[PDB]
């Protein structure tokens, strides 16, 4: 009946071979022959065409001739001058050709029955011709390919195995190990970026289905697979085939099932006929909305279809609706005469309009022909201006409507308390996609929500929960005190470069936001941060400051929402006083003075100023963003890990705030650090118990500090998360360190252990006690003022400091040795090329970089005393960018540190010496193998400004000595020159 079926009993092989592939292949052959897929045996290229002639004559009910079948193969079906994208266009759009029958006529040729799927015919065949292949023929057309692996094959290695003619039709690259099973499209990227497009079939409650047997038994029904492959595969113009995730298809079929049942019952214009879809944000609801709109277009008896959002999301997504080409994404803007003309105009079968345009149309015009017609409505992003009143006009001035909703905002139990709820506005919860299993399926990240119980002065007022007094007695002194704001500022400026992973100079970094509930707080904050950064820079003339920006206009204007969200700011510039407005203007003038921009604070430059600030906060060129009420709902930031709150929030406006961190970026970013200065964890428990059970919050957030220190055993899956000090003791005791590992299996096991160690390290990096423990490795004996000031920075009483002195960390020089050993093992397996199994932690090698500035800073600090073994310390630290190794030694083994007074003198002396040695060695590169001087110098300077080299730059023969016309060109000396120059540009990446 449906595509995503709920009630499914499962099977169990043991078997029925445990390990092999060919027996699993025979299993799935048996299963598809049980389901009704025909297993025939074709072995040649021409017998494929014979099978296609067998099937298309069955389909179209016509008879070819041999010359006619040849002419159809040549002219339309298999022109060899066409690529994969052409045939994708054919199977998704151009599925009908027109063919001349030899009795001088012209009739149609189908490919797939796009409207009667059961009339299609299915076949299954086997491999030809480095792997195992199982192919499904859809009316004799190869579209679904299934490979096989061993049991312990990693899912990353499942892609690394990458003429003939008719294998350029395939769309679904289903891959499996027999335990997990996924499916590709478009053969998009390399193995580095395949995991973005790895999907899973599941049931409609989002509980995953991974076993290949029941994956085949459920997802590979004929009525299932044909409907998936035809109806839910959008060829977005151009180059792209967007194929969904199963909950979207499930929601769409629930929508149309309810529509068809409501029309058969003739029960329209009622919440029985209504209902709603509540999917979490981040699930890609726009493509699902478009699919519902296109299928409502494809419906039989439907006159008009409408899709309504809030302003001014509309025209932006309207040009983002270009999946269809052209998609008839029409607007009046704001033409009620134009909108009724579009009503009068035919076959713009989707219309997008606002609630305000619809309300203007209804209150301005009450005699439309649409009032007794089959009308479908879909709504999204409901604020509280016309949330009931336009719905009262909808009830009044219409007769036949099917109203549906997309939202992330449920209303029913405790949200609004004074309005018509979602289930009473719309009806049944038709299908839902909660945040939980989306977090489980790696679409967004986890939470760590902590309150900063750090000030015993305002401890009662921070921990106060009296909502009446927190609403009313909120002031500028009992809750915005200058000492309180000052210590908030000192906390965040101490913990910024720790929580943004900026502990190293060559680190990547992340930006952060700080949102509050009152404007006068922010007017205090900007001058507060500015003056305290001035004082921090004046403490020792060493402190790197932070560019801090802010923006807001006006205001918490109305109620605008339920309990509890952000009241939206309007675009009135100077509605507040100039104590707020000209303050903002002077901040923007300082912004212009630092960044050379032109936006004034008028009715034009302020809005595009907001857009420009939004764009340049995204590229990590703004360190900190102070926020009153913007950047909380519609703004996305993939490079923002840490949010700071001094505000009290509620059910799911707080969820919309927490959505501003949790988006996935890479393996470095793991979860969002929520740091609140007022306790709100019970509100989080409220939101999650609203959105799930008590297991749900343990799925969502976090475990405690010690539960990651010594690790844990997960109560659900029973995994051995061993723990930080545990793995430390393991690597100390098991391996007689540093480089006494020569057996290859123990090399691999040492790699695995060290990778797990750095994984747990990066997880612990966002923890304040772990940061304090790492910074405890800079002890003073005694220097009690500095030690107590350090403990006051990290708020450490001597009681806990006793155990903190007791708990011991591993030695950092040992960790230098371990990371160097891991880099050496990686370089040893970088040569050629049991070793095609090893997990590599590439990302955190790419993290924690030192870009020679901290190196030369240590060398300048390397007094004077020690003078020889400091070169040994620098050869210890040499890793990560180790290929610039020896010449750095050649800067210090040749020159004198007495010649260089300070840091900058030795820095530009290093630049001068590097340029001199680079030119002198480039002379030898010219001299060695007859290099044409101008051409090769041009090539190498092009490569240096390009920061790498290539075997393209195809005028490279002008650099080459004599001759490569000749067929005995034996890479002479092309590979030798090329390897030498890529070693050279690796030696001089960026420098010189």
């Amino acid at each position: 009946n449906f595509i995503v079926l709920d009630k499914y009993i499962k099977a169990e092989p043991t078997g029925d071979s445990y390990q092999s592939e060919s027996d699993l292949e025979r299993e799935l052959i048996q299963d598809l022959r049980n389901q009704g897929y025909e297993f025939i045996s074709v072995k040649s290229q021409s017998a494929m065409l014979a099978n296609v002639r067998e099937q298309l004559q069955n389909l179209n009910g016509v008879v070819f001739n041999d010359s006619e079948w040849r002419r159809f193969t040549e002219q339309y079906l298999d022109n060899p001058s066409d690529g994969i994208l052409d045939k994708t266009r054919k199977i998704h759009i151009d599925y009908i050709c027109d063919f001349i029958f030899d009795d001088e006529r012209l009739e149609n040729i189908y490919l797939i029955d796009k409207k009667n799927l059961m009339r299609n015919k299915v076949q299954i065949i086997q491999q030809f011709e480095n792997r195992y292949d199982v192919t499904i023929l859809v009316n004799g057309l190869p579209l679904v390919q299934i490979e096989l692996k061993k049991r312990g094959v990693a899912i990353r290695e499942a892609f690394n195995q990458i003429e003939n003619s008719l294998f350029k039709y395939l769309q679904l690259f289903v891959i499996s190990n027999g335990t997990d099973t996924r499916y590709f499209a478009n053969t998009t990227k390399r193995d580095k970026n395949s995991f973005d497009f790895t999907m899973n079939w599941a049931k409609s409650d989002n509980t995953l289905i991974k076993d290949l047997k029941d994956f085949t038994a459920t997802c590979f029904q004929k009525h299932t697979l044909l409907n998936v492959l035809v109806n839910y595969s959008v060829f977005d113009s151009s180059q792209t085939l967007l194929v969904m995730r199963p909950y979207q298809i499930a929601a769409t079929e629930r929508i149309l099932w309810k529509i068809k049942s409501s029309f058969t019952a003739k029960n329209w214009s009622k919440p029985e006929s209504g209902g709603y879809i509540w999917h979490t944000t981040g699930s890609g609801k726009t493509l699902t909305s478009f699919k519902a709109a296109r299928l409502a277009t494809e419906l039989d008896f439907i006159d008009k279809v409408f899709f309504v959002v809030d302003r001014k999301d509309l025209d932006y997504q309207t040009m983002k609706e270009y999946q269809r080409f052209s998609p008839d994404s029409v607007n009046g803007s704001e033409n009620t005469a134009g909108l009724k003309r579009n009503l009068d105009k035919d076959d713009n079968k989707i219309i997008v309009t606002t609630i305000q345009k619809l309300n203007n149309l209804m209150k301005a015009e009450s005699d439309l022909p649409v009032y007794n017609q089959q009308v479908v409505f879909i709504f999204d992003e409901c604020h509280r201006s016309q949330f009931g009143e336009a719905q009262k006009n909808l009830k009044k001035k219409f007769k036949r409507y099917y109203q549906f909703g997309f939202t992330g905002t449920p209303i029913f139990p405790e949200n609004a308390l004074g309005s018509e709820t979602t289930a009473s506005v719309f009806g049944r919860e038709l299908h839902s996609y909660v945040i939980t299993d989306a977090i489980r399926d790696e679409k967004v990240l986890k939470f760590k929500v902590d309150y900063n119980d750090v000030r015993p002065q305002f401890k009662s007022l921070e921990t106060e929960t009296d909502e009446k007094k927190l609403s009313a007695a909120e002031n500028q002194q009992a809750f915005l005190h200058p000492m309180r704001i000052q210590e908030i500022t000192q906390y965040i400026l101490n913990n910024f470069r720790q929580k943004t992973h900026r502990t190293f100079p060559g680190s990547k970094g992340f930006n952060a936001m700080l949102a509050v509930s009152s404007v006068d707080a922010a007017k205090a904050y900007y001058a507060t941060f500015k003056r305290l950064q001035e004082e921090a820079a004046n403490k020792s003339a060493t402190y790197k400051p932070l560019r801090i920006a802010t923006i807001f206009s006006f205001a918490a204007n109305e109620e605008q929402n339920a309990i509890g969200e952000i009241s939206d700011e309007t675009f009135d510039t100077s509605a507040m006083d100039s104590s707020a407005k000209e303050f903002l203007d002077a901040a923007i003038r300082e912004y212009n003075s630092h960044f050379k921009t032109n936006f004034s604070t008028d009715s034009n430059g302020f809005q595009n100023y907001y857009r420009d600030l939004a764009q340049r906060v995204k590229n990590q060129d703004i360190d900190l963003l102070i926020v009153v009420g913007m950047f909380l709902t519609g703004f996305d930031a993939p490079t923002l890990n840490t949010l700071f709150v001094d505000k009290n929030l509620r059910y799911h406006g707080l969820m919309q705030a927490f959505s501003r961190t949790n988006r996935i970026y890479d393996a470095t970013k793991t979860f969002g650090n929520i740091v609140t200065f007022r306790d709100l964890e019970r509100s989080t428990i409220d939101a999650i118990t609203l959105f799930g059970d008590k297991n749900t919050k343990n799925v969502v957030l976090e475990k405690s500090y010690t539960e990651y220190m010594e690790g844990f055993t997960d109560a659900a899956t029973g995994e051995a998360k061993r723990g930080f000090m545990t793995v430390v003791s393991e690597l100390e005791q098991r391996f007689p360190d540093p480089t006494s590992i020569e057996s290859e299996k123990e090399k691999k096991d040492f790699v695995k252990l060290f990778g797990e160690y750095l994984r747990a390290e990066n997880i612990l990096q966002n923890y304040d006690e772990f940061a304090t423990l790492k910074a405890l490795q800079q002890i003073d004996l005694s220097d009690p003022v500095a030690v107590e000031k350090f403990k006051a920075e990290h708020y450490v009483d001597d009681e806990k400091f006793a155990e903190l002195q007791t708990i011991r960390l591993p030695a950092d020089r040992k960790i230098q040795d371990y990371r160097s050993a891991y880099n050496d093992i990686r370089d040893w397996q970088r040569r050629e090329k049991d070793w095609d199994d090893v997990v590599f932690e590439v990302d955190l090698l790419k993290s924690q970089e030192i870009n020679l500035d901290y190196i030369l800073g240590l060398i300048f600090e390397h007094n004077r005393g020690e003078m020889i073994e400091e070169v040994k310390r620098l050869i210890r630290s040499s890793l990560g960018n180790r290929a610039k190794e020896g010449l750095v030694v050649d800067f210090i083994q040749q020159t004198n540190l007495d010649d260089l007074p300070d840091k900058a003198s030795i820095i530009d002396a290093f630049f001068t010496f590097a340029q001199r040695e680079q030119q002198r060695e480039a002379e030898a590169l010219i001299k060695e193998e007859n290099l044409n001087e101008d051409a090769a110098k041009r090539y190498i300077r092009t490569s240096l400004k390009r920061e790498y080299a290539t075997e393209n730059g195809t005028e490279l023969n002008e650099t080459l000595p004599k001759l490569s016309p000749l067929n005995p060109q034996y890479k002479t000396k092309k590979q030798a020159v090329f390897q030498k120059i890529v070693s050279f540009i690796e030696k001089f990446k960026g420098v010189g």
């Binding site: 060899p80 001058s81 393209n952 195809t954 023969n957 001759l963 016309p965 067929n967 060109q969």
Partner: protein
């Protein structure tokens, strides 16, 4: 390919590994023998539509950064095959 032994007529030397290097450099092998100067020997020879297949040859070019999919200009009109032969040969 012959800046130095220069040959008016060429061979089927078959060495693909050497063939792919102008297919990285100029991105296109012309062919072994489907150059113009070889085709200029067999002018007025039936038939002429091999030029279509000739346009199959540099349009392989998938490695790397194709810049192909270009030469679809010379279609066929044309009313008889001998008209096409005589006109295109002229």
């Amino acid at each position: 390919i012959e800046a130095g032994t220069d040959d008016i007529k060429d061979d089927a030397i078959k060495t693909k590994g050497y063939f792919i290097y102008p297919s990285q450099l100029f991105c296109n092998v012309a062919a072994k023998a489907n150059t113009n100067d070889r085709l200029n020997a067999d002018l007025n020879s039936i038939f002429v539509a091999i030029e279509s297949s000739a346009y199959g040859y540099p349009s392989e070019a998938d490695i790397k950064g194709l810049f192909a999919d270009f030469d679809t200009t010379s279609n066929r009109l044309g009313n008889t095959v001998k008209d096409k032969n005589a006109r295109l040969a002229a």
